[PDB]
Design a protein around this ligand. Structure first.
Ligand code: LSA
Ligand code: LSA
Ligand code: LSA
Ligand code: LSA
Ligand code: LSA
Length: 165
């Protein structure tokens, strides 16, 4: 089947910035892709809409998905529990790679990061499950609001999100 595409409409201190869309590699990592797809549509009753990118490190990555504690300490999968690292088939090859944050082997929840460079040292530790398809320039615009320690200088939020045809 055809891989799902999801979009995030990003806002900066509540002003619209632009749209970033992702291919999710359901053909390689179906469980991981389905988690992110469902959280992006809100079909389980919760997920990414209204949440923020809480950690952004320019030249490295923009990190989000903590819709429970808003700071890197929370998140929730669609599965009732944190889930396995499905496989490490896909690697951190460059800008645009969408990968799972975690707290150790087999502890995937809802946090993820969009790489803005090649991050090969994360291979085998974080599960890659998608890639920016359109709006990488918007990820680049976002990255500028990050800082050395990851704290953001403006509030970067997913104003809306869902699945495209
Ligand atoms: O691809 C899948 N990985 S899974 O075990 O979570 C699962 C459950 C049900 C249907 C499909 C799939
Ligand atoms: O239908 C599904 N129920 S499930 O969420 O466990 C799942 C996981 C992956 C792909 C499809 C499906
Ligand atoms: O909407 C929700 N229903 S839920 O209690 O499972 C939940 C848990 C955490 C964040 C949001 C939500
Ligand atoms: O070491 C890490 N733990 S984490 O999942 O928050 C994370 C996200 C991005 C890059 C590195 C790391
Ligand atoms: O320049 C780009 N335009 S894009 O949105 O297709 C994209 C995706 C991934 C890496 C780079 C780029």
């Amino acid at each position: 089947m055809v891989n799902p595409t999801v979009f995030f409409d990003i806002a900066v201190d509540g002003e619209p910035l632009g749209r970033v869309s992702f291919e999710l590699f359901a053909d390689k990592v179906p469980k991981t892709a389905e988690n992110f797809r469902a959280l992006s549509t809100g079909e389980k009753g919760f997920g990414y809409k209204g949440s923020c990118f809480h950690r952004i490190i320019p030249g490295f990555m923009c990190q989000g998905g903590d819709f429970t504690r808003h700071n890197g300490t929370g998140g929730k999968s669609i599965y009732g529990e944190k889930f396995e690292d499905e496989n490490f088939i896909l690697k951190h090859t460059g800008p645009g790679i969408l990968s799972m944050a975690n707290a150790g082997p087999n502890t995937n929840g809802s946090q993820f990061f969009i790489c803005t460079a090649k991050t090969e040292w994360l291979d085998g530790k974080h599960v890659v499950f998608g890639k920016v398809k359109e709006g990488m320039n918007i990820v680049e615009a976002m990255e500028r609001f990050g800082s050395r320690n990851g704290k953001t200088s403006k509030k970067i939020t997913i104003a809306d999100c869902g699945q495209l045809e």
